[PDB]
Amino acid sequence: GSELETAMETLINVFHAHSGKEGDKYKLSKKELKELLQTELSGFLDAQKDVDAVDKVMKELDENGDGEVDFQEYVVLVAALTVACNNFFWENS
Amino acid sequence: GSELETAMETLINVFHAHSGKEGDKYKLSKKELKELLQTELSGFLDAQKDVDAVDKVMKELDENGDGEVDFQEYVVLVAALTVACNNFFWENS
């Protein structure tokens, strides 16, 4: 819709590109989410700054991987990785 | 960067469009965030389905409004409203 809403409707397309592994099309298993995060959010992983926070999400899901997530969860985790790569705001190169 | 990452970099731009009331531009006060959500997330607000959930965020922030958020928080709340307007998944039209 608006620029913000088209940004979010993009997150839906991307979530749905990997969703359905489990059988539910609006859900994605947590271990399968790590694949999406490693594939599309790969550039933010390469640009990570908070090595603590990036791994705090990954290792946490690595053991909880056999669970699942929906769009809301997926975006929360995406945003968390995004700020772990944005913390450079306080680094005056 | 990627399709997902440009989706998220859009969320940064549009967060920044109303940010800096407190002077920090990577932050926005919570009551001031409601404005952004009412302006840009207005279409998702119009398309709301989970009336309980949409208000759970708004009424909550209306009393917690004098605090503040960053990109991570703002995106979580945006995603929460997004799923409250996506609920048609459980509506057999």
Side-chain angles (χ1 to χ4, degrees):
Chain A
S2 64
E3 199 186 76
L4 192 168
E5 290 172 348
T6 44
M8 297 306 289
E9 93 192 48
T10 303
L11 273 296
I12 297 174
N13 298 317
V14 175
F15 179 81
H16 281 237
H18 296 252
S19 75
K21 300 251 190 159
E22 197 70 47
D24 188 329
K25 289 87 189 163
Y26 306 145
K27 306 288 285 300
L28 178 50
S29 339
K30 276 177 177 288
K31 77 283 198 165
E32 300 307 321
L33 189 77
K34 201 179 78 176
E35 183 196 63
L36 184 170
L37 287 169
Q38 284 181 181
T39 305
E40 269 290 297
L41 211 55
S42 222
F44 282 8
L45 263 92
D46 185 61
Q48 68 184 252
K49 296 293 295 185
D50 296 334
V51 297
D52 182 274
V54 71
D55 196 25
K56 193 233 74 61
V57 178
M58 294 283 179
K59 185 63 241 177
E60 180 178 65
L61 96 85
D62 202 56
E63 304 190 352
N64 284 280
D66 220 26
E68 59 170 344
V69 281
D70 81 306
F71 176 87
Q72 186 175 18
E73 249 276 64
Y74 144 79
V75 175
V76 171
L77 303 160
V78 160
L81 210 148
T82 303
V83 295
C85 84
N86 287 353
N87 206 20
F88 182 73
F89 178 55
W90 311 102
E91 190 178 302
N92 196 121
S93 58
Chain B
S2 63
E3 197 184 281
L4 201 176
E5 290 170 353
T6 44
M8 297 306 288
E9 91 192 52
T10 305
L11 275 294
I12 298 173
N13 298 321
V14 78
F15 176 79
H16 202 297
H18 296 245
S19 73
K21 266 94 174 203
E22 60 258 78
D24 188 340
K25 303 187 183 304
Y26 273 41
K27 305 297 271 70
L28 180 44
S29 338
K30 280 184 176 189
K31 78 281 198 167
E32 301 300 320
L33 189 71
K34 200 179 81 173
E35 180 196 60
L36 191 172
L37 268 45
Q38 282 182 183
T39 305
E40 279 287 299
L41 207 56
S42 189
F44 283 12
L45 263 162
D46 184 64
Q48 67 183 252
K49 296 293 287 184
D50 292 315
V51 298
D52 300 79
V54 76
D55 195 32
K56 193 233 75 62
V57 179
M58 297 291 191
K59 185 64 246 300
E60 182 179 66
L61 96 84
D62 251 10
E63 305 188 298
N64 281 277
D66 214 28
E68 29 58 71
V69 283
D70 80 306
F71 176 87
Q72 188 175 17
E73 252 271 59
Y74 143 80
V75 175
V76 169
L77 302 165
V78 161
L81 214 148
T82 303
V83 295
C85 72
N86 283 358
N87 207 33
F88 298 96
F89 303 147
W90 303 94
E91 188 173 55
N92 196 122
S93 301

